[PDB]
Design a protein around this nucleic acid. Sequence first.
RNA 1: AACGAGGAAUUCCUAGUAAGCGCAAGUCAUCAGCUUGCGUUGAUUACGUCCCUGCCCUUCACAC
Lengths: 63, 51, 94, 103, 229, 206, 11, 62, 125
Amino acid sequence: DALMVMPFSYVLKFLKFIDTVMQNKTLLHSHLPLICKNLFFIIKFNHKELVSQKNEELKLQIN
Amino acid sequence: IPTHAPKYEENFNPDKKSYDPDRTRSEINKMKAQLKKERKFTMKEIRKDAK
Amino acid sequence: CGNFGFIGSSNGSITIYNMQSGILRKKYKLHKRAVTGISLDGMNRKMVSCGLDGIVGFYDFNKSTLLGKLKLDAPITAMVYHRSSDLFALALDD
Amino acid sequence: LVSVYDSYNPRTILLSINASTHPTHVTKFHTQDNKILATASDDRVTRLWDISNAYEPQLELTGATDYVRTLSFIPAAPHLVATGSYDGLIRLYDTRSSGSTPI
Amino acid sequence: QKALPASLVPQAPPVLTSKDKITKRMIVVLAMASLETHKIKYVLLNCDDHQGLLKKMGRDISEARPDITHQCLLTLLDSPINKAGKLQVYIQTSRGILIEVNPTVRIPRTFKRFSGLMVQLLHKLSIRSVNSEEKLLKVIKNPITDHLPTKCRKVTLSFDAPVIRVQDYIEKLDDDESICVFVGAMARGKDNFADEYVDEKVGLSNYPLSASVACSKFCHGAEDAWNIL
Amino acid sequence: FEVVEEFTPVVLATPIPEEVQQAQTEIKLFNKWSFEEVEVKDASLVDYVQVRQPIFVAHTAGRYANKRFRKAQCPIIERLTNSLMMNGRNNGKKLKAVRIIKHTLDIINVLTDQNPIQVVVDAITNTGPREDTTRVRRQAVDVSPLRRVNQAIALLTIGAREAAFRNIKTIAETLAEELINAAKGSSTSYAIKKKDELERVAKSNR
Amino acid sequence: SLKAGERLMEA
Amino acid sequence: PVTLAKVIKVLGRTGSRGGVTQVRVEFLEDTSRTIVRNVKGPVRENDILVLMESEREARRLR
Amino acid sequence: AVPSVQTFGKKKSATAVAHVKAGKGLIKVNGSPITLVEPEILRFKVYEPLLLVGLDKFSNIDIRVRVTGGGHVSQVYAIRQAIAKGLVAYHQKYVDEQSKNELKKAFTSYDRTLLIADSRRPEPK
RNA sequence: AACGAGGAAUUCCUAGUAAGCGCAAGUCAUCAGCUUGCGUUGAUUACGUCCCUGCCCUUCACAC
């Protein structure tokens, strides 16, 4: 429910967070199951608005 | 604009009553009120003693 | 459904009766020559007629409206309507 | 005041208009258009009322130097309005234009 | 050559009441009026006469002055605008009582009688004319908003607020609307009494203003604004 | 192409007037106004100002207080009538309200040639406020379409009732002028002024 | 105090 | 100019003030864009709200 | 025996008994034509069935409605319910069932109360 | 003389509910300064929220 309230403008902030967490491999495997569940839930909920955006930089981060 | 004066009774006391023009009317109102009290109080006391 | 019987007249009038009571319900007048075939789909929605004038009309049985009108080259003689596939074959005069 | 009653129902009053402080001698509906109502006063101004909006006149024809007691609407020319005063002048106005000055 | 009105006889302007809501009006709301009664007879508490008593109720004697309410209710009704039938007064007692003052009334000039009326006013909830034809002072059900005119502009007197020209402010303001002013009759305190009703607050002069002078000053401008003379 | 469903003229032993037969042709309010051409101008209010199902008379005896949003399905004329009956003295008296509504629709047809139902719908659309305030100070908030329809009906009926409480005007005629001014959008109508006040107070404290 | 979701936004 | 936005979801456990429901709307003009708003009356999914401003983002109102 | 069917309509205490028999569109309520039913304002309510399925069908039947109990409004609702149910019942018994289906569909399309009793039975909460 | 719908504060209320109308009965307790039944006309607003105020409860797979 907490992630559901989030406006989209913070989701881009949230995705930018996971990107930065990926560099630090220690954190990634320490909290891998949690990062996965939140990440995939953010994408499913507001999928429609995510794809519509044409920002290339967002595309690389998802890459 | 037309202007009218307020009507009021100096040293008004709500516990005290509206001044009545007719003294006989005021006095009999006093007597009726006393009668109603004493009938109720006597009527109340009679019942309790009977009980 | 076995409730409506259609009769095609030689003067171009299509009449609809009710089988259980035999009481006339509706009457379609499009062809000016003899009607030589009538059929109603399985859904009892779309009706098709053909007559010696060579014209095929498409009626909507439920709303009683003329959906469309088609003219062929030659007079039409007989019609078979395949309800499963919604194809019907006309034996034209040519 | 100009009062509009429902004919054959004298009890009901539909619209009441305070046209002018002076007497209102002539009150005629427009033949072509149903909504617009005309009024003539000894104020010498023939206000053009509207039944929907009663608070202000749609147009206020003026220019007559004497009592106006005659108003006429010309058939087939709904824009045009004809008024007559005791000046001896029959003034013709056009409602399509700005008005307030006889044609 | 515009004609004259048919009748030029002077006609008294209609008395404006809370029931009529469309007409343009100036409303002055004497908020935070200190009008309170207590039995000794019942007497309107005074900052000076009853100082020991009010201490017993524990209320600070600074905020126990109905004289300011008297003075404001003197100047307002006595201004020409009232005589022109364009001014109506409401009073919001600190305890929370909302009193409407019919424009017709003529309050006594000496303070002592005025105390007599208010104690009568609070208890009987109404005062009637000497000729007994209309109710000059009446208590009404809160909130003030419902009684106020439908389309109306609301402001307050804030010393901190920007100074404005009252005559300028009224002119720029729309026509079919009406203007309310919430003046804080209380001596000293935070200017938030009418904040929940009002939308903006304005100032009248860089120097401090008492309630009475503030009302008269605001009244004066409206009279020049509306050509009341 | 002709389709014929009636081969005999229909003459009933019981005499039936002609107007009720012209009603046989099409369903009309009080047998005088058609629902065919009315449409809600504002897209949002659609699905919450119900005019599609045509009714002869406002009385229906439906069950519109059982579920949360059943009220939307009520015909708008019936909701206006039900809101007409208030202030206790009128309570329980629906037939009198239906009479007032019949009279008001007639008056509206008179003063304005338009189909009166269109005027009613236009008033309900125009007058319904689009943003409101909530006490925290006040903070601006949006307004649901149903609550907008509710305020529209309530404001119109209250304004009309207060207009003719102690005036020579009757409820019918004052309601007529209220609905007409609201449909025009003019500032004269009580409802439009109240709506503008609400929206502007919201605007100040956004 | 702040609720879930709202704390995450400030974070 | 006033925009029309259809609610797509009525957020829950938002801790909003009583009678104020926090909802997520998508604009009719641009179906992709979404914004979170506060609604005062009874609201359900798929109904249309008239947004005066499309810029502000809803905040919990206590 | 002439074909005839009987139906009841009920609303609050009001009860209406309708006999529909082969006839000539002679329809009466309490021994008087429908046009005199009162109150006038709600008369079209009683006309709701007649106008919906078309007066042509009634041209071959006569309807006698006898109503007792309740007030004006409940009486009207009882009348309309009785008329609708009687018409459908007769069309079932002595006319094709296709017309029966058409009649039921039209009525349940307009207002289901014409066919099913509207009983606001108490519900505790 | 009193009065023209009733101030502050406070209480109750969600569908055949609020409210209006009359007609009966007086059923071993209560009631006629009235009580209880009966039918008639019959709405608006909410039917969500734990934000405030109170009360309460908790700390045999799969998946979590």
